[PDB]
Amino acid sequence: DLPLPPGWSVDWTMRGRKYYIDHNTNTTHWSHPLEREGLPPGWERVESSEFGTYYVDHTNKRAQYRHPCAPSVPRYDQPPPITY
Amino acid sequence: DLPLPPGWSVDWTMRGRKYYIDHNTNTTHWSHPLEREGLPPGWERVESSEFGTYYVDHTNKRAQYRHPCAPSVPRYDQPPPITY
Numbered sequence: 001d002l003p004l005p006p007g008w009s010v011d012w013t014m015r016g017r018k019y020y021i022d023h024n025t026n027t028t029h030w031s032h033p034l035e036r037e038g039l040p041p042g043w044e045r046v047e048s049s050e051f052g053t054y055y056v057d058h059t060n061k062r063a064q065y066r067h068p069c070a071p072s073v074p075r076y077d078q079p080p081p082i083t084y
Numbered sequence: 085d086l087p088l089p090p091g092w093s094v095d096w097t098m099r100g101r102k103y104y105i106d107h108n109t110n111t112t113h114w115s116h117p118l119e120r121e122g123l124p125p126g127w128e129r130v131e132s133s134e135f136g137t138y139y140v141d142h143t144n145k146r147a148q149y150r151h152p153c154a155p156s157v158p159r160y161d162q163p164p165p166i167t168y
Contacts, residue, residue: 011164019163028163046158052151053137054158063160065150067136074130074138076147079103079112080095 002034030056043068086118114140127152 004010007024020029031044039045042059045067056063066072088094091108104113115128123129126143129151140147150156 013164021166026166028166030161030163048158050155051158052154056160058163061160061162063158065154065158067149070136070149071134074132074135074147074149076140076145077114078145079114079142080097082105082110082112 002032005033008033038067038069040068086116089117092117122151122153124152 004020007022009021009023010018011021012018020032021027022029022033029044030046036044039055042057044056044058046054046056046063048054051065054063054065055068057068088104091106093105093107094102095105096102104116105111106113106117113128114130120128123139126141128140128142130138130140130147132138135149138147138149139152141152
């Protein structure tokens with residue numbers, strides 16, 4: 001229920017998808033403006049039942065599962081061996 | 085603090101990484117056995133500061149950001165237009 005900055009509101013698409021309106025700039029967004037720490041300019045984190053969590057780049061109209069700032073690939077670590 | 089099934093315990097690596105021991109099978113795991121709904125056999129979800137959330141495949145010793153059952157690529161949706 002985190003409070004929006006002045007000049008922001010929340011709305012829903014005709015199919016019921018929540019989104020945010022920035023009346024200061026007349027732009028629309030999928031995520032809360034105060035929930036974007038760690039994300040670069042132009043990107044948002046999206047939650048969904050269809051895809052789970054992913055990331056969108058509005059400038060380039062792209063979506064990807066990898067957080068845009070995460071290492072290019074993650075590391076596999078074998079769980080520790082059983083000791084005797 | 086979710087209770088473990090019988091024959092399971094929790095331990096830590098020398099560097100302090102939590103893990104789970106299944107004494108029923110003498111196998112080790114990065115995630116709680118009761119926190120794997122929606123994951124296929126052999127896979128685990130991993131949380132980390134280095135990579136954020138990702139997924140590991142123990143059989144093939146692979147790691148990836150995409151949930152193994154998620155669609156191959158996620159969809160970009162443009163936020164709704166401003167109406168006048």
